[PDB]
Design a protein around this ligand. Sequence first.
Ligand SMILES: CC(=O)SCCNC(=O)CCNC(=O)[C@H](O)C(C)(C)COP(=O)(O)OP(=O)(O)OC[C@H]1O[C@@H](n2cnc3c(N)ncnc32)[C@H](O)[C@@H]1OP(=O)(O)O
Ligand SMILES: O=C([O-])CC(=O)C(=O)O
Ligand SMILES: O=C([O-])CC(=O)C(=O)O
Lengths: 92, 1021
Amino acid sequence: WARELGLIRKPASFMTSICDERGQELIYAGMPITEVFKEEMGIGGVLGLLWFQKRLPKYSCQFIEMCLMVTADHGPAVSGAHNTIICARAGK
Amino acid sequence: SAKAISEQTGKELLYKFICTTSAIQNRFKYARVTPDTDWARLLQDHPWLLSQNLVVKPDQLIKRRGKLGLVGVNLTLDGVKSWLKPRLGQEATVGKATGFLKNFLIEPFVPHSQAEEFYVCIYATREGDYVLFHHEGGVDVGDVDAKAQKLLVGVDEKLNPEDIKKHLLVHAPEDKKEILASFISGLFNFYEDLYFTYLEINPLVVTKDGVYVLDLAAKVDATADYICKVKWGDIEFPPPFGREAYPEEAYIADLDAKSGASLKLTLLNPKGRIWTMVAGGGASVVYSDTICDLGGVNELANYGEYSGAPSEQQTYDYAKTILSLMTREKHPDGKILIIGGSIANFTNVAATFKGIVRAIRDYQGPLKEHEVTIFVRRGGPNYQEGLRVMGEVGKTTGIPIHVFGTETHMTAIVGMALGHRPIPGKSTTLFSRHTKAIVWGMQTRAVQGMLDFDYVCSRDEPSVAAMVYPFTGDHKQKFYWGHKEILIPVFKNMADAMRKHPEVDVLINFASLRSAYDSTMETMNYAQIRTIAIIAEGIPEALTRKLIKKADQKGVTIIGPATVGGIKPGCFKIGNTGGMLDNILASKLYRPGSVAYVSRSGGMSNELNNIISRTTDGVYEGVAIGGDRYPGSTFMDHVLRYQDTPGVKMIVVLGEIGGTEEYKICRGIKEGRLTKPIVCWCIGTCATQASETAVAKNQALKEAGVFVPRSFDELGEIIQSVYEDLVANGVIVPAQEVPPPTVPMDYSWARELGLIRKPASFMTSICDERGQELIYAGMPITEVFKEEMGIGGVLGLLWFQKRLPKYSCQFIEMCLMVTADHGPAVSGAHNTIICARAGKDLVSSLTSGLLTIGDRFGGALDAAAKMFSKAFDSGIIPMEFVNKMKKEGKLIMGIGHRVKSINNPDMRVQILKDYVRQHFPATPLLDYALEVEKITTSKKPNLILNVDGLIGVAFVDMLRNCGSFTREEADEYIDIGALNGIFVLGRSMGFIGHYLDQKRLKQGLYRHPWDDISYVLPEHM
Ligand SMILES: CC(=O)SCCNC(=O)CCNC(=O)[C@H](O)C(C)(C)COP(=O)(O)OP(=O)(O)OC[C@H]1O[C@@H](n2cnc3c(N)ncnc32)[C@H](O)[C@@H]1OP(=O)(O)O
Ligand SMILES: O=C([O-])CC(=O)C(=O)O
Ligand SMILES: O=C([O-])CC(=O)C(=O)O
C-alpha cells in the first residue's frame, strides 16, 4: 500500500533483461510473443532474443537450429549419455 | 597528532638511529628510577654506574627543570640516592601543574665548559621545516632569528651540508665546524626518516672527545606509526604532568579504545553541579566555553564526549559511570545534567536515547534523591521519538527533563541552566550545477546521499560520474535518481575512469589514512581534476605537506584532510556533510542563500547550517577545511575565494584555538582587499604563544573590524543583526521559496522506525546466523562444543531441533559410518567416478553421484522403515506379515543378502544390532524385524536383515522409543524422508573419496566399449 502511493524506495536487486512476464503479453527482448510468431522466426530466433537480446537474421537463426540438430546426440558410450542412462536406469 | 614523548625513549632512538661520520658517546648509558623498582638490580645490570659522575633529572615532561632546581648535578651514587630520598614518590609542582613526581632519569655526568655547549632546535612548519642553531653555550642563546642561525628547508628537499657550513655556521668557531655540520646533517636525516615533529636539545656538549646530549624535548608524529612500527619499537607516550586519574576516568579511558567511537571524559571540579553528557567535539568545546563565560568556570564539573555512533552497551556504561558520579555528594542549588550536542549526520537519535533512558531508569532513585535536572537538546534523523521518550521517562520517573530540538539555539539551554534567561591557477569557482565528481572507494551510502542532494536541488544531471575501487572489477552499481534506478559505473583503475569521463573536475578520496597519499598523487597526474577532497583522517603531516606542495605546484585545490567535506546548496555536496535529507530539508539546503561559512571541525558545520537557516537567508557555499593542522586549503584561500565570488554577501568564519591562520584575514581586512561583511567567532577559550588563545584572537578580530559576538549565544543573534542591517542597504533580496522535489523514504530507514509491515516469507527454525553467535536449535555453538556432543548431536539439532541423548547421537554417527561407502560398482559411485574422470570439480562429481540415489539405489532405507512401521503399527504378526507380502507379489525390502547367509553374518549389521541391544532402552520394532528375518531365513538362508533394513528399523525405533518425541513427530520424519538424508549424508563421504581418488590417480576420460551396448535401432524411419 505504501509502494502504491510511492512514498518509499526499496533497492530492487535481480536485474534482468530477457523476459517481461508482467503486462499483457510475453516480451522476450523488446518484441512481443505474437510478433515472434507472426515474423515466423524459428527456435534460433528465440535463442537470439533470449541469449543475445537481438533479432538475428534468418540465416543466423537457421544456422543456430542447424548447429543444435548436429549436437543433438552422439551415442550412449559418451560420458554424459552414460550418466543419463545410469541415472535413468536407477529409477529416477 | 603531535604527541610529546619521554626524553629517555627519544635519546634511546637518537643513539640508535643517528647517521653521522662523527662518534657519539654515552652509548646505551642511561638509567630509570621509579618507586616500584629497587637499586641492587639496576646496579647489577648496569656496571657503568660506578665509573664517572652522575646526573639526575625528572623524566615526567617537566619544562625548565634547571630553573626551578629539580635537577641533581655533580653528585655520586649515594649522593643521588640521598637526593632522591626526599623527592621520589610524592607531590611536586612546576609552573601551575602540581602532581606526583614518579620517574627519574639518570645519566653519566660530563664535566663541561660554557663554550662547549650548543643549541639546536628543529621542528615542522607548514611551508617546510625550521632548523635553529646557536653556537654560544649555556641557556643564554639570545634571539633566535638574527644571531642564532635560522633555516627554511623545504618539503621533499635534500639538505646539503655545504648549506650548513655556508649559512648555519657563519658565527660558529672554525675548530668545530665539520663535526657539528656532520652532526646537524645526521640529525636532520634522523628527523626526516623517523618522522618527528619537534626536537630541542639545549645542552649539546661537543668536546674534543665527541658529542654528548644531556637534555632534550621531543614531539613525534603519532599518526605515522604504520610507517614506523619496526623503527619505534615499543614507543611510549607519557601523559602531561599533573594530577592522577580517577577510577571512573580510567574506566572511561579503557572503554574508549575498545571500539571505533570516541568516548572521552575529563573532570575539572568533582564537586560541581554543571555536568556534560554531550555528543560532538565542537559542541562540547562551545558548551565549556559558554559555561566558563556565563560564570560557571568554577562550577563546570567535566567535559565529556561521545562521538562516532557508540553502541548501546557503550553509552550505557558511559552514562552509568557519569550518572553515578554526581550522586556521591549533593549541592544546595541542585545539580544539572546537559544532554547536549550538535545535529547528528546519520546516527539514529532514538536508539541512543533508548540506551540513555535505560541507563537513567536504572538509577532513577539517587537522581530523585539528589534533586537533579536534565536539559536535553539534540537533532538529526528521528529526534522526535527521542524527545518523546525523554518526555515519557521524565513524566514516569518524576525527574524534570526539559527537551528541545533544532528549533532553538544549541547553547541557549545553558542560558537557562544558570537562570540567565526565562524558561519556556586556483579557480574561484569550485562547484557549480555542471560539476561532476569521482568517488574513490565503496561509499555507496555517501554516493546515495550525493544523488539525493542532487535530486532535491532540481539539478538535471547526477554529480557522480564514476567510482574507483582497485579491489573489484569494472561493473555498474545500482543507485537512485529520485524514483528511478540508474547505474553508476565502478572502475578498477583510475585511468579508464578518467578517459571515459573527461568532464570530471572533482575527485573525492574516501581512501584510508594510509592509502590516501598514493591515490592523491595518482589523481594529480590528470590535468582535468581541479579539486580533491580528502576525507580520511590520520595521514602523517609530512605526506600532507608533500600534498600541499604539489597542490601549489599544480593549482589543484585540496579540501582536507580530516574533513567531512563541503556543501554548496543548489550545486554540489561532498561526502557526508549535512547528513541525510532530514537535515538538508531541515536546514533548507536545497536552494542557495547569501551567507558563506568556513569552519575547521565538521561537527560544527551542521550547527552552522542550522544557525544560517534559522537566523538568515541560507547557505550559498560552506566548506569544512578539516581538523588536521596542515590543511590543503586554509581559511585565507577560502575567504578570498568567497570574496572573488559575487554571489555571496557575507562570510562567517569559525576558527578554533591555535594557529595564526586568521591573522592573515585580519591583515587582509586592514589591507582593504576584504570588503564584504564578516562574522567571526573563536571557539576553544579554555582559560582555566599568548596570541594562540581564543580570547586574545577575539578582541584582535573585534578591533580588526569584524562583527565578533561576545559568546556563542549571540553568534546567531549577531548574524541576524548584520543580516537585518544589510538588507536595509538593498543588496540582499530573499528569493521566493520554491518547494523542492520530494524523494520517497528508504525501506530500511522506515523499517528501523517501525512504520511499515512487509510479509516475511522463508520461515526457518534450524539456524540463527544473526546476533552474537551461531544458534542451531535454541542453544549456542559454544554450548554445543562444551557439552561434547558429536556429529550426531548436530544432526539432532539441525534435522530434528532436539537435543538427542548420547546413545542416540553415537548411533547416528554409527549408522553414518557404515553407510559411508559400499564400493565403486554401485550405481552412484559409478556416476561419481564417471563425472570426476571427465574433468569436473568436486561439486559436480559428488552431485552427479548423489542424483542416482532414488528408489532403486539407496531406497531400501526409507521404504524398509515405512514397510516395517506399517507392519508393526497395524497389529499383524510376522508369520501373517510374510505371507501377506508373498501373496501381494512384492518382496520384503531391507531383507535379503546375496552371499552372506547363516553363521556368516554381515559384520556391520552385527555391530549396529549389538549397539542397539545394549544401548537402546526398548526395542519393539527391532525384535519384530528379527522375527521376520527368523521366518525368512527358515525360508532361504540368505534372507537376513540388510544394513539398509536394520538402520531403517533401528532409526524408527530410536525416534519412537527414546525421549523428546511426541509420537506424531516420530512418525512424521519417516514420511518426510529423514532416512534418505542419513543415506545421502553417509554416502557423500565415499563419493568425495571417490572423486579425490580418481583425480589423484590421474585417469583420462572414459568411453564405454561398443561391444557392451547391443544397439537395437529400427531399420528405417
Ligand atoms: C566529527 C566528524 O564526523 S568529522 C569526520 C572527520 N574525520 C573523518 O572524516 C575520518 C573518518 N573516515 C575515515 O577516516 C575512513 O578512513 C574512511 C572514511 C576514509 C574510510 O576508511 P576505512 O574504511 O578505514 O578504510 P578501508 O575501508 O579502505 O579499509 C581499510 C584497509 O582494509 C583493507 N582491506 C579491506 N578488506 C580487506 C581484506 N579482505 N583483506 C585485507 N585487507 C583488506 C583495505 O584495503 C584498506 O587497506 P589500506 O589501509 O591499505 O587501504
Ligand atoms: O557522517 C559521518 O561520518 C558521521 C557519522 O556517521 C556519525 O557518527 O554520526
Ligand atoms: O543402498 C543400496 O540400496 C545399494 C547399496 O549400497 C548396496 O549395494 O548394498
